[PDB]
Amino acid sequence: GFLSGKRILVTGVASKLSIAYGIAQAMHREGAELAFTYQNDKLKGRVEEFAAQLGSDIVLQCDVAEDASIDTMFAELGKVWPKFDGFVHSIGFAPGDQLDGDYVNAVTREGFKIAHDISSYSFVAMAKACRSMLNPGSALLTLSYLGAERAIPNYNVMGLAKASLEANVRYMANAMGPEGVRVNAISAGPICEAVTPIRRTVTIEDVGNSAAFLCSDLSAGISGEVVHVDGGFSIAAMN
Amino acid sequence: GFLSGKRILVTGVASKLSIAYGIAQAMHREGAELAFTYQNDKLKGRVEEFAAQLGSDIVLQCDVAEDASIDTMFAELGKVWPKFDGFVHSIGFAPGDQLDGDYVNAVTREGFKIAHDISSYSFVAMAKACRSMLNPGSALLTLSYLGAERAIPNYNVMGLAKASLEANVRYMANAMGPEGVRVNAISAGPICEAVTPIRRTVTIEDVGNSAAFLCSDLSAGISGEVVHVDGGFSIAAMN
Amino acid sequence: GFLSGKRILVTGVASKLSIAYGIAQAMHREGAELAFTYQNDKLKGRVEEFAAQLGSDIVLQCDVAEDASIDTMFAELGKVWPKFDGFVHSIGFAPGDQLDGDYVNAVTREGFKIAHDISSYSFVAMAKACRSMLNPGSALLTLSYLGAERAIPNYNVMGLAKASLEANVRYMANAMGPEGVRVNAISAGPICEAVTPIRRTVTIEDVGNSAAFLCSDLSAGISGEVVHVDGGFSIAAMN
Amino acid sequence: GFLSGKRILVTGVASKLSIAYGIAQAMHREGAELAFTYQNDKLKGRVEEFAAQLGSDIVLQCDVAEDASIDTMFAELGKVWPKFDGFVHSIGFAPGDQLDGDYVNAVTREGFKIAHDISSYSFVAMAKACRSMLNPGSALLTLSYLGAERAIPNYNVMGLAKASLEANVRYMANAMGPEGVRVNAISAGPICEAVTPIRRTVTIEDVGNSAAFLCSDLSAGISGEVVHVDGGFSIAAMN
Ligand SMILES: NC(=O)C1=CN([C@@H]2O[C@H](COP(=O)(O)OP(=O)(O)OC[C@H]3O[C@@H](n4cnc5c(N)ncnc54)[C@H](O)[C@@H]3O)[C@@H](O)[C@H]2O)C=CC1
Ligand SMILES: NC(=O)C1=CN([C@@H]2O[C@H](COP(=O)(O)OP(=O)(O)OC[C@H]3O[C@@H](n4cnc5c(N)ncnc54)[C@H](O)[C@@H]3O)[C@@H](O)[C@H]2O)C=CC1
Ligand SMILES: NC(=O)C1=CN([C@@H]2O[C@H](COP(=O)(O)OP(=O)(O)OC[C@H]3O[C@@H](n4cnc5c(N)ncnc54)[C@H](O)[C@@H]3O)[C@@H](O)[C@H]2O)C=CC1
Ligand SMILES: NC(=O)C1=CN([C@@H]2O[C@H](COP(=O)(O)OP(=O)(O)OC[C@H]3O[C@@H](n4cnc5c(N)ncnc54)[C@H](O)[C@@H]3O)[C@@H](O)[C@H]2O)C=CC1
Ligand SMILES: CCCCCCc1cc(=O)c(Oc2ccccc2C)cn1C
Ligand SMILES: CCCCCCc1cc(=O)c(Oc2ccccc2C)cn1C
Ligand SMILES: CCCCCCc1cc(=O)c(Oc2ccccc2C)cn1C
Ligand SMILES: CCCCCCc1cc(=O)c(Oc2ccccc2C)cn1C
Fold first, then answer.
1. What is the SS3 assignment for A183?
2. Which domains are seen in chain A, by residue range?
């Protein structure tokens, strides 16, 4: 398939419902060899069994809050994949008290800090830590949401963190392009269907197929882009 | 390949250099059955020989200046493809005097009219004329340029026509989405490489592979989008 | 006030409810000297009355469909205002059949042509005809709408004409900036409330006050810009 | 003039070259009553002098790194201004090592944290601390830069902090609009010329005059907006 001969690392698999799960299935179907990370002890077993279902046995701990954890993870990866062809960053977090009610009342310096650290900074923390490992032709991908560009109730400081993330995508695409790395995002629709042009919510399958494309040599002409995979929702008003 | 079982009509093939040529080759490689149009008597033979190289013998006249020509073309197409799965609109024109020097001095009411008529209106003229022929799952694609969103010297009234075209993409995606049709554009880089993140100009191959994706079921979650296939050029400043 | 010393031509005053009326009041309040145009002979008496209220006796017929009508009006205006400091373009039209129902069903070649010609081309047609009459520090302003940027039901081909208009603002700003002319648009909110951040619809006073600003030397740093005067409607989602 | 009756707090006046100085002059000229903050004790004497020139005796220490410093300053401001009509946030910082060389090489977790905290979070930290002191009709303003929207060499992690800042403008406008507060940004040009439409770099006077407008009731229709006061630089390409 169109990912044959690519080696891609997939973060963010927590359940069958995760966007990363959908991506990993589409990529496996298209011929990629996959590696997986897991945040913590709680998730390890689930990520192991998914990885085995998709023919992989590279399953490594990584908590992106910690530089040491990211560096250890990539050193472990290096033992099986001394070089590889990019990674999927499918990692977001804000403390729960951030995501309820009026934005100005809910946001705090600490909730802002963590939101941006885990949802935006970690994408470039990963890229720094594996830069010398990426083959020419490599592609990095992260996941954003319309909250980066619109004020959405309750999404609150997560929209600011997604705006920072989308800027990260541009700054990374520019920094890494000369070494043959591309960096993009998918702004996914929520996983309001009567006002979506395609008249349905997007699935992790739709997102997974767009992700596979954006990490493959098919998308060689695309870098620094935030592609809306939301069924046209963001381009409509008042349906 | 990922277009197997799709029937796609390709406009705009004038030479081996055309973007439509690149698209048609990528689509053929991915398994599509193709049909081609040609503007006029001058181009017919070239388009015939390309179509035969790619295993097609559906080659039909269409001048998008004329409603009758578009309607005749689709009636002819209907004899071999009573239904089909969308089309590639790769058609642009402005009179040559429009594209030289200061924009305000060069533009005229007539040059504006023709620019917008041929570069923007014809995309929806086609969609009107074949609406009842499109299978669910169909996808229409047109080609735009950064001139739609930036003032570029000499591109002049063609930037206004491309802005109209990109709006057309949104309005069409919204109108046709409920019948299972998607409508997108690729904003292609020029066919300034030191300030492009990927450090090279895009080719008709890059554009062709993005086009094949956007007309396939892989891109089911994408509609109303203008995807930049320009190597990240539009997202950079001052390199 | 902040338009003292400035001579501005105001098009498109058709009634007390016109946006151009709110604009003309705001500019007169800030001490601009004003002239007015009117489209045809049914509006003549009433624009004369509006102009007199604003201490102006300069009221000239102009149909922006015709190059000869624009040249004549500017030739007349030159008899009183050999030079002047810009104009407000508050002119929009599409045929009524364009603006109701499914976009792809309603739009026609002729309706697209007339919508783009009157609502977009006319702005640059006016610039062309008065370019040599403009002082250093002049400012041109037109009015646009969110339908340039999103698919809105019924607005249909106006949203394309508006997108062409906003690109016209950029190309015009770029062309004329070197000789000391700025060019901007207001994207005005409809003249609903519960999802607009300011929780009220904008008024012609709101718009007029922004228009006065954009035509005055207070906005000397702003050119080629589309300013949204819509109470924040466009930057909100899902309220 | 058009800020008569308004009480506005101005942060970030550090020298006569500061953007906040150009803003404070423009607002004082238009009859606003002003208060000022300063970051630490080296700036104190000189902000006192600038304030006196502008007929103000209200000059309060505030380090926006600390929640306690913001609360104290607003508690002090309340002794003279139990209510007031908004503030200008003209505060930006990243550590010096963040702003030179390859973005992915320079950025660190701590430099990202400090850049977002001081240049983005502080704008909403101030809003939080004075929300109950604001009159109906109040207006908040911050300063951003094109690096929010494009990858600019060296600006590096500031471009992420700025993108977060502009999203903060939208979320804040959306949250506070219902209680009668507007929130906007200026995206200012660098304070080069040959590709800017107006063919000159913008000045703190240009910026100040736009800031005065955005804080006055003349801009009652504008909220959650990023206004580009960069002479049209951002809307041009390839001059
Ligand atoms: N669910 C949706 O509707 C949409 C989600 N997104 C984004 O898609 C991405 C994935 O989301 P989902 O798959 O929906 O939810 P999820 O909860 O299934 O995935 C989130 C993942 O982030 C991981 N994570 C959190 N903090 C981490 C840390 N410190 N170190 C390592 N991993 C960490 C979790 O372990 C989990 O695997 C996120 O960036 C989210 O913002 C974007 C658009 C819409
Ligand atoms: N060449 C480039 O750098 C870029 C081109 N584009 C766009 O890509 C599209 C294709 O361009 P190219 O392949 O470069 O040039 P081309 O000249 O090879 O293709 C233009 C095609 O338009 C056709 N055409 C013109 N008027 C027509 C009419 N009345 N009826 C039917 N067909 C008509 C011509 O026959 C020709 O096949 C155009 O929309 C162009 O604006 C977009 C970005 C960059
Ligand atoms: N009303 C609204 O909610 C919004 C209106 N707009 C735009 O504001 C502008 C003014 O609109 P309105 O003040 O609402 O309505 P209006 O009907 O008062 O003004 C339209 C004006 O255009 C003139 N016009 C039309 N064809 C003309 C021609 N051939 N030659 C010369 N003048 C011609 C009419 O005589 C009239 O003065 C238009 O461009 C419109 O698209 C923008 C955003 C929202
Ligand atoms: N200079 C330029 O070309 C442009 C500047 N900007 C933005 O305009 C704003 C003002 O910048 P400038 O006037 O050029 O330089 P500046 O150096 O005069 O002003 C920066 C101000 O931020 C203050 N500040 C920094 N950390 C602070 C803290 N912890 N607490 C309180 N105050 C703190 C400094 O004391 C100073 O008053 C910044 O947000 C900057 O990013 C935007 C576009 C272009
Ligand atoms: C219908 C209106 C609101 C739409 C929200 C869509 C959406 C966006 C996301 O980023 C997301 O992920 C997170 C969000 C916060 C914290 C952690 C994560 C992983 C989940 N969801 C569901
Ligand atoms: C390097 C600065 C300028 C970049 C221009 C790129 C570019 C854009 C196009 O739309 C294009 O097509 C046309 C343009 C006008 C008329 C007819 C057609 C088919 C060709 N080219 C080459
Ligand atoms: C759902 C649709 C909401 C649109 C409301 C805003 C709106 C936008 C406009 O450009 C407008 O002007 C015209 C429009 C068409 C033809 C002629 C003119 C003068 C009026 N109105 C009301
Ligand atoms: C190629 C780079 C061009 C950038 C020039 C415009 C520019 C943008 C800014 O935000 C700025 O302010 C700061 C920037 C960093 C840290 C602290 C401050 C206060 C200064 N300058 C000059």
1. strand
2. 1-239 (3.40.50.720)
